[PDB]
Amino acid sequence: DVNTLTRFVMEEGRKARGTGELTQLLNSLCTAVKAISSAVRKAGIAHLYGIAGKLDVLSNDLVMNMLKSSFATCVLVSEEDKHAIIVEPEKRGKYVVCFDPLDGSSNIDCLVSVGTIFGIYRKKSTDEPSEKDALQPGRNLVAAGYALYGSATMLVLAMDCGVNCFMLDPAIGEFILVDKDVKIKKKGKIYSLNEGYAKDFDPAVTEYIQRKKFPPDNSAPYGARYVGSMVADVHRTLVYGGIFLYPANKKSPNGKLRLLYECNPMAYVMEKAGGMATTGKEAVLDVIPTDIHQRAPVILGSPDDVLEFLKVYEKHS
Amino acid sequence: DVNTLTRFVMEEGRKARGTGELTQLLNSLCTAVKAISSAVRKAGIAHLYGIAGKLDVLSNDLVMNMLKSSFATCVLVSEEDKHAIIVEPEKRGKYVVCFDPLDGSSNIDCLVSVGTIFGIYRKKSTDEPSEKDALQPGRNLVAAGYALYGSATMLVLAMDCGVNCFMLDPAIGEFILVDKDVKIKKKGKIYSLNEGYAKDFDPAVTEYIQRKKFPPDNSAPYGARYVGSMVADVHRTLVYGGIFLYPANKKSPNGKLRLLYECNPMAYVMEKAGGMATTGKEAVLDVIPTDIHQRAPVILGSPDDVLEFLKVYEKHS
């Protein structure tokens, strides 16, 4: 039987017998994602070029406005906003959403794959909503995932029930379930990091990458891929296995990616798919944040690959 | 004034006072590309998943059928076909087209950017049309370019008048001219290659990459990007500058990329944009092919970057 995101989410909600807010939140996100995809694909660009005589801001406004209007949220943290957005009282719901509305958009001028990343928390206290309501470890996530605006648009949704992938059919604006309960390979054959900055690598990163290129045994070197857009590189890691790294070094001891709306949602997707996501020192999902925009190092992907990285990491510790 | 691919090509044709065949060929190609884009973005995928109860083959069929019916072609070489396709007598025109209908599609399962690459030649010999009509050096190209199905769909068309970039507006199915007479940066800050083959690199490649990561003048290291899809990596190279390399290795001693419908069209785009494209020993466009599917090593991109590589290549003889 054909299954849509709308039907899938609603059936998960019925089985859980929640209040319906999470379902409304997910419907609003899906609508925002379809609108981002339409704009990312440049629908209407002819009008901008005068046929009748910003993209990351627009994407943020789409997510912000759809989530506010869901009546399911009270605190919104975006990569685009200095401060957490507090939802107005008459529209408050119980969920906190941290999101990057258009990840990788810095390089969108080369038409590289871009994406939207989101993580959904339940507000824990009855206090007046504030930025602190988003300062939860990723292990508290109720749902997380991403939309990839690649060759096609796909939404990957991770919940307690596992990871499910939905392909956007743009002819009808429906996300069609195409991969159920996905699991990552135990061990992959691709490593993914920006090797242009090798001179700044932590010595452990240098050694691990060297083992991928010059294996000490008789196995094949790993292939290298680095899109530079986190959603694309993570999704490839999910689909094909392997390891993705944006690690710490001396110049950047906390990494560069952002914990709340990049590392944690991806870490959650990975673990729900049977993968791993570490800072090197702890699981990403166990970091307790103190700042809504704080950075975290992230090494994620197939468990055997991440464990091997941790073995080398400890060797230099 | 807004300008479309249709209007642009027709206006180039009027000025040249040709017979109109090249214009009809390009109109057909544009139509095929819009049809490829729609299928790549998964329009109609819900019917495949049962709402009412292969992508590279379809792409090949679209290009083949649109080109045959243009009455402008006589010999068609596709990555998808072992032998050259000879157009039936009643539809034959004067042009030979070499194309990759859906480049990068091996990894389309992770929704990586894919593309269509094409090169157009005038049939040179007066013999009955045959596979040999496609065995022309790239310097004989009349027109070449590619469509990138990335975050948006863009057609890059290079002719004697230069390189022009058209964004597909999917709301109206029109390619809108958005970048005229494009020129690549003289020198970039990104290098692009699969570093997993580091164990197989010739010393010149190894040294060049080492200069990008550890510059001897103590300037900033280059960033690294490698999508693994040639159209995406070359388009980023064109738009941001820098260098793209696919040299020979032990699996691919004559290189990996195909001369006829990957290297030559990209080399032609590069040169018309003020860039360079070399095998290491000669310019790609000067290689005389003997086999329609033969491979070639390629180093292309910003001229200062390729020239620096060639100095290293010469230092190692």
Next chain:
Amino acid sequence: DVNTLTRFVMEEGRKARGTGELTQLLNSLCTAVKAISSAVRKAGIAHLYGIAGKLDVLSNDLVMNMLKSSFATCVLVSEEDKHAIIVEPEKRGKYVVCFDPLDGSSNIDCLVSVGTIFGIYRKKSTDEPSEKDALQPGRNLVAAGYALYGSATMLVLAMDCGVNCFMLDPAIGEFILVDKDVKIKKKGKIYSLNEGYAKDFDPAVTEYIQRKKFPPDNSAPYGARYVGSMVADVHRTLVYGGIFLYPANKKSPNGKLRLLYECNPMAYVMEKAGGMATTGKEAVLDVIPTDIHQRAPVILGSPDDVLEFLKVYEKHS
């Protein structure tokens, strides 16, 4: 605040605290309507004409399969099927749906507006479901409405809470609420019927029409409009007010339109909008059917217009 069909329906469901089946049914219908719209607008028609080398059947299959897979239905009556379809046990829910999947499609060759009409009933008994479960008076309707595939695509949904109109935004495949709690004009200025059957008209219809052309109170004559596609004619009646007639004639002594999936849903939409719908002798919604394909005469629209017709009808005893 922007509102979607999905969000709107789910909020009505949350307030009523039902089992969720009606919501899942309405989501499935909405999906079917978007797919019918895409096909009606001829998306993909180029593939039918050989670019790479039935509409009412497809519409019926789309509605049938989406309703079956909703797990919300047990009995399905379609204009396209001689007998009621009994949903197999593992997919059964409590609702009976009567629908015309592509109304007006006989003239779709002139690209006349077409539409989808539906009426939803709750099955009352614990008996095994059967065709007789659809033999309910319109008064028992739980929900009804139509999709109009006109210059744009619009879904009109009537429930106990009133009538709401949603515009399909094809850029994102979303139904946007554009008119809330719709009410028809008390009196219109347009009458709508096929006057080619004037030779067969009941004297009451003949006199009523003569009053529209030669008003007895010295007002302006009514304009005439008759698309010949019921959904288009009824929707204009809803939007501008006025009256729509399909009375009996010699070919159709019980009228021509079908009671279960044309007259009753339109009668229900009209009444929830403050209009009227009569056979001449009784309210459409009060007719108790004995056959799922039985026909009924129908006069509907603004209350003052319908009352005026009824006064003429009673004058003719």
Next chain:
Amino acid sequence: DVNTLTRFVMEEGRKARGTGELTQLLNSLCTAVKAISSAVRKAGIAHLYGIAGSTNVTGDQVKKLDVLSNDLVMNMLKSSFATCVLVSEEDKHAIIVEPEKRGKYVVCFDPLDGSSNIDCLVSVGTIFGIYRKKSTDEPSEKDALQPGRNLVAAGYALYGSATMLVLAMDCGVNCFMLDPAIGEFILVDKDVKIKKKGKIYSLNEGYAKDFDPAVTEYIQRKKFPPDNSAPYGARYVGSMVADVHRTLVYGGIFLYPANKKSPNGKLRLLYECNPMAYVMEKAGGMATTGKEAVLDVIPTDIHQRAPVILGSPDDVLEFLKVYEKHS
């Protein structure tokens, strides 16, 4: 072989060995029609209703559709470099194309015919007629005051259940279906010809009290045939492109005649009656004012009205016989 509007037009141009301006004009129009279709189908309407907040709505998105359609047609024709004088239903005076963008063609068009009732989602359309400028004077409004006989090409786009462009030239009438998945007009019916006689009549009968006596009698013959044949069916959408296109595909007769209150009719000669009359005649149909062929009226005002009776030749001839009987 599959055929597109672009390929088809270019092939007619190659055979004629013209300058290519007419082909560029038709390409520009085709682009404008695709944009009108997208807007008419309400692409992007969610932004008007606040999906991105009360900030991200653009200038073109707020414009009413008939203004936007006029802007699309105007700008695409100007930029074709093929036109010198443009007449639109929306503009009191003719637009004279600026000198550096001038070509030899005069275009009269109705950018969004029927849009007054677009609020009920009625079929709407774009109507166009193309003339070659005849005089050596500087281009001016007078260049559009040509009889329909002088038309080089005409036709319409219908935004109905699907979008179709009907294009009439000397080679006849061809119908192209817009495939919105790829934005291509696909040729679906070649060299179209109307039925000799139909079974549908189309006019606003609500205004029967004002009918010309000949119209009253003709309509009475359609509803109460004297030879005991079947009465005609009636259809009246109220949108000319829809009613005329149905007439072309199914046959029959469409009337917007004169009366004492409107002795010259209601529809506009330059950009409604003449293009529709040209299409009808190229399809083997007829189009009359009652007194003469529509295409023979020589206009004196770009917005002058004309009565029109068109459709299957047998039907129009029967109408004219009744009209002559009433002298």
